[PDB]
Design an enzyme around this catalytic site. Structure first.
Site, PDB file in Angstrom:
ATOM      1  N   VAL A  15       0.830  -1.221   0.000  1.00  0.00           N
ATOM      2  CA  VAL A  15       0.000   0.000   0.000  1.00  0.00           C
ATOM      3  C   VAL A  15       0.870   1.278   0.000  1.00  0.00           C
ATOM      4  O   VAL A  15       1.738   1.422  -0.872  1.00  0.00           O
ATOM      5  CB  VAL A  15      -1.147  -0.021   1.078  1.00  0.00           C
ATOM      6  CG1 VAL A  15      -2.187   1.047   0.788  1.00  0.00           C
ATOM      7  CG2 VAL A  15      -1.826  -1.388   1.112  1.00  0.00           C
ATOM      8  N   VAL A 137      -6.529  -0.269   9.606  1.00  0.00           N
ATOM      9  CA  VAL A 137      -6.831   1.132   9.297  1.00  0.00           C
ATOM     10  C   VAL A 137      -6.293   1.576   7.935  1.00  0.00           C
ATOM     11  O   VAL A 137      -5.138   1.317   7.588  1.00  0.00           O
ATOM     12  CB  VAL A 137      -6.357   2.096  10.441  1.00  0.00           C
ATOM     13  CG1 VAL A 137      -6.639   3.540  10.087  1.00  0.00           C
ATOM     14  CG2 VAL A 137      -7.029   1.743  11.787  1.00  0.00           C
ATOM     15  N   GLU A 139      -6.282   5.125   5.048  1.00  0.00           N
ATOM     16  CA  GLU A 139      -6.012   6.576   5.092  1.00  0.00           C
ATOM     17  C   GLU A 139      -7.019   7.430   5.880  1.00  0.00           C
ATOM     18  O   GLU A 139      -6.652   8.101   6.846  1.00  0.00           O
ATOM     19  CB  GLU A 139      -5.832   7.135   3.666  1.00  0.00           C
ATOM     20  CG  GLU A 139      -5.614   8.661   3.575  1.00  0.00           C
ATOM     21  CD  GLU A 139      -4.380   9.140   4.325  1.00  0.00           C
ATOM     22  OE1 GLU A 139      -4.492  10.057   5.168  1.00  0.00           O
ATOM     23  OE2 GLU A 139      -3.289   8.600   4.082  1.00  0.00           O
ATOM     24  N   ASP A 168      -1.296   7.642   5.776  1.00  0.00           N
ATOM     25  CA  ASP A 168      -0.296   6.745   5.169  1.00  0.00           C
ATOM     26  C   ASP A 168       1.099   7.351   5.005  1.00  0.00           C
ATOM     27  O   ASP A 168       2.007   6.985   5.740  1.00  0.00           O
ATOM     28  CB  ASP A 168      -0.859   6.117   3.883  1.00  0.00           C
ATOM     29  CG  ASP A 168      -1.787   4.980   4.261  1.00  0.00           C
ATOM     30  OD1 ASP A 168      -2.857   5.214   4.783  1.00  0.00           O
TER      31      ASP A 168
HETATM   32  S1  COA Z   1      -1.336   3.275   3.984  1.00  0.00           S
HETATM   33  C1  COA Z   1      -2.819   2.673   4.739  1.00  0.00           C
HETATM   34  C2  COA Z   1      -2.681   1.204   5.130  1.00  0.00           C
HETATM   35  N1  COA Z   1      -2.627   0.973   6.571  1.00  0.00           N
HETATM   36  C3  COA Z   1      -1.552   0.493   7.198  1.00  0.00           C
HETATM   37  O1  COA Z   1      -0.444   0.393   6.658  1.00  0.00           O
HETATM   38  C4  COA Z   1      -1.730   0.076   8.647  1.00  0.00           C
HETATM   39  C5  COA Z   1      -1.237  -1.357   8.901  1.00  0.00           C
HETATM   40  N2  COA Z   1      -1.733  -2.303   7.907  1.00  0.00           N
HETATM   41  C6  COA Z   1      -2.950  -2.847   7.976  1.00  0.00           C
HETATM   42  O2  COA Z   1      -3.759  -2.551   8.984  1.00  0.00           O
HETATM   43  C7  COA Z   1      -3.389  -3.818   6.900  1.00  0.00           C
HETATM   44  O3  COA Z   1      -2.285  -4.634   6.481  1.00  0.00           O
HETATM   45  C8  COA Z   1      -4.036  -3.138   5.678  1.00  0.00           C
HETATM   46  C9  COA Z   1      -3.025  -2.297   4.905  1.00  0.00           C
HETATM   47  C10 COA Z   1      -5.211  -2.266   6.109  1.00  0.00           C
HETATM   48  C11 COA Z   1      -4.549  -4.184   4.680  1.00  0.00           C
HETATM   49  O4  COA Z   1      -5.221  -5.269   5.326  1.00  0.00           O
HETATM   50  P1  COA Z   1      -5.386  -6.704   4.612  1.00  0.00           P
HETATM   51  O5  COA Z   1      -6.202  -7.566   5.545  1.00  0.00           O
HETATM   52  O6  COA Z   1      -5.879  -6.482   3.208  1.00  0.00           O
HETATM   53  O7  COA Z   1      -3.862  -7.240   4.518  1.00  0.00           O
HETATM   54  P2  COA Z   1      -2.955  -7.810   5.734  1.00  0.00           P
HETATM   55  O8  COA Z   1      -1.656  -7.048   5.793  1.00  0.00           O
HETATM   56  O9  COA Z   1      -3.670  -7.741   7.061  1.00  0.00           O
HETATM   57  O10 COA Z   1      -2.578  -9.311   5.271  1.00  0.00           O
HETATM   58  C12 COA Z   1      -3.488 -10.408   5.396  1.00  0.00           C
HETATM   59  C13 COA Z   1      -2.708 -11.708   5.598  1.00  0.00           C
HETATM   60  O11 COA Z   1      -1.969 -12.035   4.415  1.00  0.00           O
HETATM   61  C14 COA Z   1      -0.649 -12.430   4.799  1.00  0.00           C
HETATM   62  N3  COA Z   1       0.366 -12.200   3.741  1.00  0.00           N
HETATM   63  C15 COA Z   1       0.773 -11.017   3.268  1.00  0.00           C
HETATM   64  N4  COA Z   1       1.718 -11.219   2.322  1.00  0.00           N
HETATM   65  C16 COA Z   1       1.905 -12.548   2.207  1.00  0.00           C
HETATM   66  C17 COA Z   1       2.731 -13.333   1.411  1.00  0.00           C
HETATM   67  N5  COA Z   1       3.565 -12.773   0.539  1.00  0.00           N
HETATM   68  N6  COA Z   1       2.674 -14.683   1.536  1.00  0.00           N
HETATM   69  C18 COA Z   1       1.834 -15.262   2.416  1.00  0.00           C
HETATM   70  N7  COA Z   1       1.023 -14.524   3.192  1.00  0.00           N
HETATM   71  C19 COA Z   1       1.042 -13.164   3.103  1.00  0.00           C
HETATM   72  C20 COA Z   1      -0.355 -11.618   6.054  1.00  0.00           C
HETATM   73  O12 COA Z   1       0.637 -12.222   6.887  1.00  0.00           O
HETATM   74  C21 COA Z   1      -1.700 -11.609   6.740  1.00  0.00           C
HETATM   75  O13 COA Z   1      -1.730 -12.776   7.556  1.00  0.00           O
HETATM   76  P3  COA Z   1      -2.958 -13.190   8.509  1.00  0.00           P
HETATM   77  O14 COA Z   1      -2.371 -14.191   9.474  1.00  0.00           O
HETATM   78  O15 COA Z   1      -3.948 -13.946   7.651  1.00  0.00           O
HETATM   79  O16 COA Z   1      -3.446 -11.900   9.124  1.00  0.00           O
HETATM   80 CL    CL Z   2       0.119   8.135   0.871  1.00  0.00          CL
END
Ligand code: COA
Ligand code: CL
Ligand code: COA
Ligand code: OXL
Ligand code: CL
Lengths: 427, 427
Positions: A15, A137, A139, A168
């Site tokens: 992101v 969370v 933006e 962000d």
């Molecule tokens: S800039 C605005 C974005 N906000 C933030 O950066 C704040 C912190 N991030 C989050 O709160 C979330 O990550 C956001 C960006 C909101 C997106 O949430 P998602 O639910 O769409 O994505 P997650 O990061 O929570 O990931 C979900 C699960 O997928 C696993 N995962 C990621 N990448 C890989 C790879 N390459 N291979 C295997 N698995 C992968 C993550 O570990 C995560 O695992 P869970 O155990 O299922 O939560």
């Molecule tokens: Cl940004």
């Protein structure tokens, strides 16, 4: 040479928040290796595309100076490759949801075991220990959590999101401070540390003045310089007056100065048909005689009703709207030019088109044309900090899995076992 | 131990951008000595006071963890003392007008001669090289210059400033990145560098996404996710529905998502009387089935015009207006509870009152009560980065010239030399 030459960054970020952080580190010399999901990669690749099946400007403007390796991390082969990459890393950066890196086996305590020198850097919505620490969370929710939305916009309108990325990109820049601070101690201690930035906290940091005003409001019952304290000026949707006899929390002030020097957004010639035909105009106290010369009000220099902050505080909006009458036949640049002669703090609302094509911003390297000989060239924001000793060298964003083999070869694997990784769908 | 222990900062800063930078360094352990103007000092001291003759909250919230020495810099004796302190310092921080530090003897070149190790750090309004390099700028003038105001607010309203300090505190945080990176590169080169952040550039860095959209708009003629691209939703000066037919610069989108994930700011119970009774509701891509269960409409789970982002893009304001009517009988925390069970990106608009006195922000050290025995205790924003190895200790802001004699004694000056300086009105 470059400040972060020889810093190896293991970059899990997706992101905008985390990617802003690691990109800027790359600009300052860091070797950044971006770990992406197999097949799709970082969500920004497919978000807001201008050309079908080409990585969007959302990705390329946030992922220059990086190499890309696809990896399924929920596999035993993936976890072992990670462990090797951690041992060669100076900084790990991630912005997954709360506890996600933990559930992959990579808790801070196990990371310390792998590499005593590696810094772990996290962006999260809320801080560790917060009642809301487990929330995900994006933006605008972050802007709402940190006090920005409550204090942005007009008194008779709703809470208003800012076009500036308070959630962000701002958290990513704040995370960069934490990382560079961790590097500064590591020279003393020889040890890595965990550093975290919450998006709410990063927003609250930029809203420090509003926390100032909250206390001022609690202590005195008024913010005299706010539009709600101006005589018969502010009203709600039903025509009820909005005043401080009823206000217990910092209100929206429209286009008010926000600090100790009153200001307002003033119409210039063309405002009816040009959305940005405006200047911002500040009544700095040391500038009042000059303001009186400019607007042909000599009788206002010696009048105690006009010549101090205290005297003007009940007539601010009268003064602004009268000043504004002087700008009716002048565009924003000539008004800016005209005020500049008196030394008055005044400036144009710059449109995104105007900034995109401004020669000064390209000359100084803040707006950079990136040479992308695959997708075609694009603009980006470069380094906002300028240094006497070095200039950044911005190179194009990676294609998905473009450096997978290059990176696995750097880990001392041979052609045979890297083919097993492609075969097992770990890479 | 703290990252910036033993880092000596000669601090010329006043107002907001520069002080924020040096305070935050002080929070991370740095030794900050603040040079102030004789008699009046930093101008924030007497701005927006809540008590006559007491340093304002504007000053105390930007000036904890600092010592104060009064100094007339345009005297021979002042320049003499400044030269001695430069040799002791690791970092010189200033945010005077363009060329002002040059004009009183201390150019970058002269500074190098005095101390080959000292870093010069500056906040300016515009970058050196810029056409507008000469312009003195305040908070909202910078927000207008950097493209934030043009893209904040509503299509039918003016450019809107953000409650968040995009100009001041944000440039100061950006400058802290520059200082720290110059400290990293000093471990190699053994030499200090000059570093500067322009307020326009710091604002631009946070509107990276708007420069993304500017290119998208020039390249394609449309921005599909913007309210102006929605069928018969937004209207103009007289009554005609808006379109991207005649929009060539990024427009204001009201409370739109600002990214690939859509959104809107929705009223909650009591919005008529409580300005912050609102939630932000984001519609994430993967979180779509979770939303359909709440709205009491499971029709959208299979509907081809509702389950895709490309299918949703033409009725975004139809959905948002309806789900708002559900919230009419719940407050913002009840609405957020009604949605947290699904992991839906919904969040409350937090008021400044709620944030100042929230238990979580205090527990985690983001809102901090400063023990100030002279003026009374006040709140402030603490360090927004959290470290595993240390915690900041925030000490009250200094009285004007409180440490003058103490600072002068550290330079090995006898009691007679000190009294001569006071009498000659240098200190
Ligand atoms: S800039 C605005 C974005 N906000 C933030 O950066 C704040 C912190 N991030 C989050 O709160 C979330 O990550 C956001 C960006 C909101 C997106 O949430 P998602 O639910 O769409 O994505 P997650 O990061 O929570 O990931 C979900 C699960 O997928 C696993 N995962 C990621 N990448 C890989 C790879 N390459 N291979 C295997 N698995 C992968 C993550 O570990 C995560 O695992 P869970 O155990 O299922 O939560
Ligand atoms: Cl940004
Ligand atoms: S929140 C961010 C606000 N803005 C900035 O930080 C951007 C950079 N700074 C500025 O644009 C100006 O400093 C602002 C904030 C606009 C204030 O304008 P002033 O009218 O106050 O101009 P200066 O601050 O540069 O000060 C004017 C002259 O006074 C001299 N001076 C300062 N302090 C001393 C002391 N202690 N002793 C003697 N002289 C002092 C400055 O050097 C400056 O010199 P000139 O040669 O007269 O310009
Ligand atoms: O916010 C500001 O900078 C002001 O009011 O001068
Ligand atoms: Cl600020």
């Amino acid at each position: 040479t470059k400040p972060l030459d020889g810093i190896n960054v293991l970059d899990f970020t997706h992101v905008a928040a985390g990617p802003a952080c690691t990109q800027m580190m790359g600009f300052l010399g860091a070797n950044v290796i971006k770990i992406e999901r197999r097949g799709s990669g970082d969500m920004t690749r497919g978000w807001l595309q201008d050309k079908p099946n080409v990585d969007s400007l959302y990705f390329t403007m946030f992922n220059c100076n990086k190499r890309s390796i696809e990896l399924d991390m929920k596999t035993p082969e993936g976890k072992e490759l990670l462990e090797q990459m951690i041992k060669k890393a100076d900084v790990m950066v991630e912005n997954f949801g709360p506890g996600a890196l933990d559930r992959m086996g990579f808790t801070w305590e196990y990371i310390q075991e792998l590499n005593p020198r590696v810094i772990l850097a996290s962006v999260k919505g809320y801080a560790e220990g917060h009642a809301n620490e487990h929330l995900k969370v994006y933006e605008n929710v972050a802007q709402c959590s940190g006090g920005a939305a409550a204090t942005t916009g007009f008194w008779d309108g709703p809470p208003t999101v800012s076009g500036a990325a308070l959630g962000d990109s701002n958290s990513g820049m704040h995370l960069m401070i934490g990382i560079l601070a961790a590097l500064e101690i590591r020279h003393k201690t020889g040890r890595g540390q965990k550093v975290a930035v919450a998006m709410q906290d990063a927003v609250l940091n930029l809203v420090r003045i509003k926390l100032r005003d909250q206390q001022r409001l609690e202590r005195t019952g008024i913010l005299a310089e706010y539009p709600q304290a101006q005589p018969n000026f502010a009203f709600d949707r039903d025509g009820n007056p909005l005043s401080f006899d009823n206000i217990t929390s910092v209100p929206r002030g429209g286009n008010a100065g926000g600090g100790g020097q009153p200001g307002w957004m003033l119409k210039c010639k063309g405002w009816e048909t040009d959305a940005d035909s405006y200047v911002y105009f500040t009544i700095a106290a040391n500038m009042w005689p000059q303001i009186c010369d400019m607007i042909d009000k000599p009788e206002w220099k010696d009048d105690p009703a006009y010549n101090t902050f205290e005297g003007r505080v009940d007539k601010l909006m009268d003064i602004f709207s009268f000043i504004e009458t002087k700008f009716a036949d002048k565009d924003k640049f000539e008004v800016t030019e005209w005020a500049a002669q008196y030394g008055i703090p005044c400036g144009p609302v710059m449109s995104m088109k105007e900034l995109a094509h401004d020669p000064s911003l390209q000359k100084v390297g803040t707006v950079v044309e990136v040479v992308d000989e695959i997708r075609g060239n694009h603009l980006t924001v470069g380094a906002p900090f300028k240094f006497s000793g070095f200039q950044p060298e911005i190179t194009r964003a990676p294609l998905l899995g473009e450096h997978t083999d290059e990176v696995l070869k750097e880990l001392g694997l041979d052609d045979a076992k890297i083919k097993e990784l492609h075969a097992k769908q770990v890479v």
